[PDB]
From a paper:
The [name] structure was determined to 1.7 Å resolution using the Zn2+ anomalous signal. The asymmetric unit contains two monomers of [name], which PISA indicates form a homodimer. [name] comprises two domains, including a smaller domain (residues 1–70 and 400–454) composed of a β‐roll and two α‐helices. The larger domain (residues 71–399) has a central core reminiscent of a distorted (β/α)8 barrel. The water molecule hydrogen bonds to Asp345 and His290.
We reconstituted the biosynthesis of the benzoxazole moiety found in nataxazole by adding two enzymes (NatL2, [name]), to 3‐HAA, ATP, and Mg2+. We have determined the structures of both NatL2 (homologue of BomJ) and [name] (homologue of BomN) from the antitumor nataxazole pathway. [name] catalyzes benzoxazole from this ester by a mechanism that we propose involves shuttling of protons to control the fate of a hemiorthoamide intermediate.
Numbering used by the authors:
A (entry chain A): 1 to 493
B (entry chain B): 2 to 494
């Protein structure tokens, strides 16, 4: 795939020193970064290349651009199959009758638990062609917003359809399976077992076997538990044994909601982080989604275990979640030295991407502390790249522009009014830009996106296949009448 | 003449926060005549005089969202400080940044001293520098959909900003800089810096000059820079001026954690109580920030039916804690005080109204665990109708209703961010911003189309601004040409 020199722009590395190079350069050979730094230092690396390699060198003039490492979104859910029903296309245009529901008002724990336990049934209701079309468009939207490495933490989609989508798109993907074996029902004093733990674990073992063979280096997998509410002691024990035996990372959602601790005590006799700790899951392998509603003992367990938190401050308000300011635990654990990364979470229609989440962290963590240095723009970038990659156990290959790492990078245009006179274009990007301002996306030295358009894929073709799949799934599986769906899709066209 | 904008989703920000899918706006000359469902507005077109119904300009807005023009009632022209104020001369790396100025609770001595130096710098800029910088600064607000702009104290010449607004075709509430005290660290009491009567005479001169304006686009509103820099005589003088001429009034108060202690030490009393003693806590008051208020001061604001302008998009990067440290502004909004959203300002482009609406939607909802506390339509009302009420301009602007000025925005809704969403304002708050404003109409006149000036050339405004900034920065701020010329030499086009 040959050599590429990207020169002249401001280069953000997200390396250990959070290095920024004005008039910087990145030299890539095949899939790897070979040199990054001042243009003059990188030109010395170009002159050291084999003559046959230097002769094929592609020079990209990035003088009116900012270069970033590819975003690593380690906490994401494929949910686009629910685009008509889940807070989606059938809502009234007026928001005035909206109610506090689902995750809002501290969490409707019965409704959340019941909803999560229904995923297996809905996944089985979609065809493999519907699953592939929805996955490919959903994952394209992440790639288009600069996500080069995507982490599944439990999707309403078929795992191997999402793996096939990632293979076709050219992006990196950490695949998972849906894992729920208990429900918290309103008529009961105790959790109701819905599945055999061994069956849930066999489903992940099948995925692990299928991606073990992948030759691209772009596909990994990571087991998750959907939510500690929907987790038996047997599933927790089984997950601990699986991640030890196969040397894997582990993910779950825990301390996500004000009402979680009381539901966990009532139905399981113990709170989320303590149940994980008794199974041996609170350790360096753990990425905890949200992880804000933790008492002092649970905070100390996370610190002692050197666990990881994925935080989604771009999307809490619109869900009615209070996982930032009600406890202030995640910023406090970050100050105490816990690894904290930024993720999008997900929804059934496009929501905040990584770029929007970086802005949210920069605004919100700094405002809470009355400190513009708590999250610097380069910290928000590290939290969406290098630190995220560390939580996913992919920081061997991705998350920073350093020699020997994968050539995964973004170009953003910096020639318009938003960037004028600013020596810190990442700051202008966090003020006034977002996902739609990502211009070029390169993964393993291959250009996947240029001018905001697919190079090897057509967004228009992915959209058409996604809409066709959504029509089939929505009318057949969700039982929304074709008479209500077809007119909406006809007005897109 | 008559213009019909039809087919899109129309947000009115009327008293019911009305949203019309497949809506229309009919304008005749400068005014809205009908707004509602496209079919209802076509009946209004048929009820027009036939000569008017003939010569109707039809704008197909079927793939667009229509909004009222944004009303940014709390803004400062600060672009003259682009080289020194968190500006163009900073290192590209942010890693050495320190907590300064407004951060860490507020450096009250430094803030007071800084504000008291504005008059000197305003006198140092030429009328031509003032006009060029004002016109570009105010263009950036217009390009981001601001149709009505409120000056709350600028580092610029008042008549230059009035001339800039007249030239651009936007609405402007002009003010003068007002500071007559400084908090000096070597003294136990405030130091009087100017005669109150002289400060008031400067505003009286502006009021006289804009009294004659025939456009209906120019008003004025006196402000006090900050209650730290305000003598009892200036407050009493302002109260008499706004009563005699029936004007609104604006100031910054309760902005910083360290304000109350500095106000007690140097003035013997906190900000809102000092305003109440002068008779300024009433329906005319727009209080900037207004978060660090005790229970008695909150009750004074409620009793007075005063107004708060909140800038949650920009607190974090300034190290301000005017949202979460006290929670007072969301609490006063819940209690039924008028609260609007504003950008505040900086010396380089920062968060516009679109970014501030997103911030409010995320941040107020997250604090309350309530996705309904600020609905997207509430964020819009806070940036339009409610802002106009605080500025006392809601007679003519802030909502799309019959008899109001034809001030509106068109945003394209045909890309991936909007696909299948019956609530394009929600998609706009998730994933769009100032740069996604397509068309801006003021009094029925198109000023911006496709994000470009219709009557003005953005490239020409930029070059005049850069020429003026070079002169002012080297001559008045005493930055060597050797530091300025290289930055200007790098400017993209
Ligand atoms: Zn270096
Ligand atoms: Zn050297
Ligand atoms: Zn219940
Ligand atoms: Zn087994
Ligand atoms: Zn293995
Ligand atoms: Zn095995
Ligand atoms: Zn136990
Ligand atoms: Zn504590
Ligand atoms: Zn999640
Ligand atoms: Zn590692
Ligand atoms: Zn530059
Ligand atoms: Zn001092
Ligand atoms: Zn002069
Ligand atoms: Zn003049
Ligand atoms: Zn001093
Ligand atoms: Zn008078
Ligand atoms: Zn008068
Ligand atoms: Zn007094
Ligand atoms: Zn109180
Ligand atoms: Zn202000
Ligand atoms: Zn309300
Ligand atoms: Zn009014």
């Amino acid at each position: 795939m040959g050599a590429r020199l990207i020169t002249g722009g401001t280069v953000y590395t997200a390396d250990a020193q959070e290095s920024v190079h004005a008039r910087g350069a990145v030299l890539t050979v095949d899939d790897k970064v070979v040199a990054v730094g001042p243009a003059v230092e990188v030109e010395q690396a170009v002159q050291a290349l084999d003559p046959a390699v230097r002769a094929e060198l592609r020079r990209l003039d990035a003088s009116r651009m900012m270069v970033l490492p590819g975003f690593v979104n380690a906490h994401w859910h494929e949910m686009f199959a629910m685009g008509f029903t889940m807070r989606g296309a059938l809502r009234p245009p007026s928001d005035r009758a909206d109610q506090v529901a689902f995750m809002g008002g501290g969490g409707d724990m019965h409704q959340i638990s019941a909803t999560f336990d229904r995923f297996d049934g809905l996944i089985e209701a979609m065809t493999e062609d519907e699953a592939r079309a929805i996955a490919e468009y959903s994952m394209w939207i992440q790639l288009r917003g600069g996500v080069t490495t995507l982490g599944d933490m439990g999707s309403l989609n078929r795992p191997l359809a999402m793996v096939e989508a990632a293979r076709r798109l050219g992006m990196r993907f950490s695949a998972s399976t849906w894992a729920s074996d208990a429900v918290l029902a309103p008529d009961r004093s105790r959790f109701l077992r819905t599945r055999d733990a061994d069956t849930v674990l066999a489903s992940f073992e099948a995925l692990l076997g299928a991606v073990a063979a992948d030759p691209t280096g772009r596909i990994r997998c990571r087991p998750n538990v959907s939510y500690v509410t929907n987790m038996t002691d047997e599933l927790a024990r089984g997950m601990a044994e699986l991640v030890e035996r196969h040397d894997l990372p582990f993910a779950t959602h825990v301390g996500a909601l004000r009402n979680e601790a009381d539901a966990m005590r009532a139905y399981h006799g113990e709170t989320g982080v303590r149940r994980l700790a008794e199974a041996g899951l609170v350790d360096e392998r753990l990425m905890a989604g949200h992880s804000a509603f933790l008492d002092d003992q649970e905070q100390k367990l996370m610190l002692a275990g050197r666990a990881h938190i994925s935080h989604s401050p771009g999307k809490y308000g619109p869900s009615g979640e209070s996982a930032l300011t009600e406890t202030g635990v995640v910023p406090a654990l970050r100050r105490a030295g816990l690894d904290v990364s930024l993720s999008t979470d997900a929804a059934a229609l496009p929501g905040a991407g990584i770029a929007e989440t970086m802005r949210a962290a920069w605004q919100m963590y700094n405002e809470m502390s009355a400190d513009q240095t708590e999250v610097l723009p380069t910290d928000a970038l590290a939290m969406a790249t290098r630190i995220a990659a560390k939580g996913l156990r992919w920081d061997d290959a991705v998350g920073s522009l350093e020699p020997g790492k994968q050539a995964d990078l973004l170009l953003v245009r910096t020639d318009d009014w938003r960037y004028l006179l600013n020596p810190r274009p990442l700051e202008s990007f966090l003020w006034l830009a977002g996902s739609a301002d990502v211009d070029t996306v390169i993964v393993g030295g291959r250009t996947l996106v240029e001018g905001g358009r697919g190079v090897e894929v057509d967004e228009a073709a992915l959209r058409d296949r996604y809409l066709q799949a959504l029509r089939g799934f929505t009318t057949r599986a969700l039982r929304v009448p074709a008479e209500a769906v077809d007119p909406v899709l006809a007005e897109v066209a």
